[PDB]
């Protein structure tokens, strides 16, 4: 409905934990566990108001689970891995008028190698959507 | 082309 919008903040981040050989089974090449999350800003952190679902596109190595739909919050994706790669985060909005957006998030894996969770990276974008 | 590399 017409020409008014709101600017909204969307944050895509990633955290990672290193998995020591002492904690992987015989045939498990996963050196890391990571968690990509999608969130709003400090002012309002819950994007459930205006977000319908999130599509996570991943590297072909994750086939057949390279495409993941998180419908209801928290919009998080946890997986095991060995490699860094651009994660394509595709957001769909509850309002039919606002078209979907892709956010390319560069996954950053931990290199402290202490086996503890660390903060990898963060991608921040401003989104426009029909207010009314 | 889809590229993936390990940190270490
Ligand atoms: Cl380096
Ligand atoms: N915001
Ligand atoms: N964990
Ligand atoms: N879900």
Residue numbers in the entry:
A (entry chain A): 201 to 332
B (entry chain B): 24 to 31
Paper text:
The YEATS domain of YEATS2 binds to acetylated histone H3K27 (H3K27ac). Taken together, our results identified YEATS2 as a histone H3K27ac reader that epigenetically regulates a transcriptional program essential for NSCLC tumorigenesis. YEATS domain is evolutionarily conserved from yeast to human.
The overall structure of the YEATS domain adopts an immunoglobin β-sandwich fold between eight antiparallel β strands. YEATS2 uses an aromatic sandwich cage for Kac recognition with the acetylamide group of Kac clamped by aromatic residues Y262 and W282. Nevertheless, the YEATS domain of YEATS2 utilizes aromatic residues conserved among all YEATS domains forming a Ser/Thr-lined sandwiching cage for encapsulation of the acetyl moiety. In the complex structure of YEATS2–K27ac, the H3 peptide is stapled into the YEATS domain in an opposite N-to-C orientation compared to that of AF9. In the complex structure of AF9-K9ac, the N-terminal motif “K4-Q5-T6-A7-R8” of H3 contributes to binding whereas in the complex structure of YEATS2–K27ac, the C-terminal motif “S28-A29-P30-A31” of H3 participates in YEATS2 recognition. Notably, H3P30 at +3 position is anchored at a hydrophobic pocket of YEATS2, which promotes proper registration of H3K27ac. A recognition signature of “Kac-X-X-Pro” is unique to H3K27ac but not H3K9ac despite that both sites share a consensus “A-R-Kac-S” motif, which explains the binding specificity of YEATS2 to H3K27ac. Analysis of the peptide–protein interaction using LIGPLOT program also revealed that the H324–31K27ac peptide is stabilized by a hydrogen bonding network and hydrophobic interactions involving a number of residues including H259, S261, Y262, W282, G283, E284, F285, and Y313.
